[PDB]
Design a protein around this nucleic acid. Sequence first.
DNA 1: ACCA
Lengths: 336, 5
Amino acid sequence: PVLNLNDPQAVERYEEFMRQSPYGQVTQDLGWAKVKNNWEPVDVYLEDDQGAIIAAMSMLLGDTPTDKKFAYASKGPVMDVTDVDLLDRLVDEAVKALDGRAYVLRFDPEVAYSDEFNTTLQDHGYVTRNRNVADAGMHATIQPRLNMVLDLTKFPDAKTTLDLYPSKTKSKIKRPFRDGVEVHSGNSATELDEFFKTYTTMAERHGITHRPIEYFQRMQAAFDADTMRIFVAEREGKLLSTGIALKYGRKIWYMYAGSMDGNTYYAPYAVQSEMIQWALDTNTDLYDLGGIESESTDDSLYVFKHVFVKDAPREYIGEIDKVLDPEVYAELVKDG
Amino acid sequence: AXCXX
DNA sequence: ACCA
């Protein structure tokens, strides 16, 4: 069925499935539509014989230079996507809800790449985008496909962040705290302003693009302080670095960061240490530091995140496209 | 445009 | 030079 967004009882039932699923993702929560307020939301689910939801897809529809919308279920659907027969049923529902308004339905679930899974998806008629577009770099896909994820279930008796790490890394983590860095956290307007100053400062420094403050304000209004937490590192009243982390499903996800110019006193290490501590304190399975370009010491993303994740990066299946209008699809998408 | 998210 |  299609979710009636003006029906609060249906919406609470949909949200309760999302929030309790082991496949849940923040970008599949209905709150994500409130963040992406320039996109149009279309949400579908499937029920079992008892009428309980067993699968859901939150899509957002965006504009293109053509008559057709681009429909995108970010890190969705919420279900075991390897159970492809079930996936076809849910995508079938999504396609009926779209009503021919979109040229594609794209989803990019956090499931590992494998040759057999890629071949199955293609056999069921999906177009996949992963190792065939790898040469175009991290932005060949909308979300990074290679991700640095810390599996905390390997450390069932860890009490603090330092319990996860070799002595050499312990030292690195201890450094900012020894030198006076302190971290506080919350999800109020005060922390948001602190984040935003460091975010815009970093943005100008790396010469990259950055989101307006209203994006983060909408995200603060959508998610409570048990879901969204801003971490702020200072040394003796001086603002050094921040990070935004979202706790949802099986993971705490470090999504956004900023840091001031010049000497940061290794404050970004202190932010990570406290975000990891949050994951330990809430018995979260995973701490996700997010995307890298390549597993190489030439990639500054991998080098920094490799301090906290000694395992290999996780490589996901990438983008899975249900092609609905092939003429517009060939115009707008290149298959590498 | 740039990290997703 | 690195701390997105």
